[PDB]
């Protein structure tokens, strides 16, 4: 299971 | 923000007038987090060889880096961190994060340096984000 996508730079 | 937009907007974006041909973010288990529309089907042995090459630099160099069965010559990389390959005028950069693998595959007229720029800088951001 992929972790959540981090907030975009 | 989705994993797909990370590929679409931060890997497949314009770099000095050029674009990657394929790009993807993989978990180190070999699962796709997101990939471009025609990113090669990576074999389990290709993922295992990539993981081993990061753990032991020089593992793939004498035999070649393989992506979807396509052979790349291992060129200069960063031990434990960045794999770089060439196939004619094209090539590939694989940047390791703590949990993932960031892929970028390019063709001429895009250069290896432009591919390194987009792939390694996104991988750096994911590392700095705890991934």
From Swiss-Prot, chain A:
It is found in: Membrane. It comes from Arabidopsis thaliana. Coiled coil: none annotated. Might be involved in the organization and polarity of the actin cytoskeleton. Involved in polar pollen cell growth process by maintaining tip-focused cell membrane expansion for the polar extension of pollen tubes. Belongs to the formin-like family. Class-I subfamily. Induction: Up-regulated during gall formation induced by root-knot nematodes. Interacts with FIP2. The chain holds residues 526 to 534 of 1051 of the full protein. Residues 1-9 have a biased composition (Pro residues). This is Formin-like protein 1.
Swiss-Prot record, chain B:
It is found in: Cytoplasm, Cytoskeleton; Endoplasmic reticulum; Cytoplasm, Cytosol; Nucleus. CDD domains: PROF. Keywords: Actin-binding, Cytoplasm, Cytoskeleton, Endoplasmic reticulum, Nucleus, Plant defense. GO terms for biological process: actin polymerization or depolymerization; defense response; inflorescence development; lateral root development; leaf development. It holds the Pfam family Profilin. InterPro entries: PFN, PFN_euk, PFN_sf, Profilin_CS. One of its GO terms (cellular component) is cytoplasm. It comes from the Eukaryota. Binds to actin monomers and regulates the organization of the actin cytoskeleton. At high concentrations, profilin prevents the polymerization of actin, whereas it enhances it at low concentrations. At low concentrations, associates with the poly-proline motif of formins to enhance actin filament elongation rate. Binds G-actin and poly-L-proline with low affinity in vitro. Binds ACT1, ACT7 and ACT11 and inhibits actin polymerization. May be involved in the cross-talk between vesicular trafficking and the actin cytoskeleton. Inhibits cell growth of various pathogenic fungal strains. Belongs to the profilin family. This is Profilin-2. It comes from Arabidopsis thaliana (Mouse-ear cress).
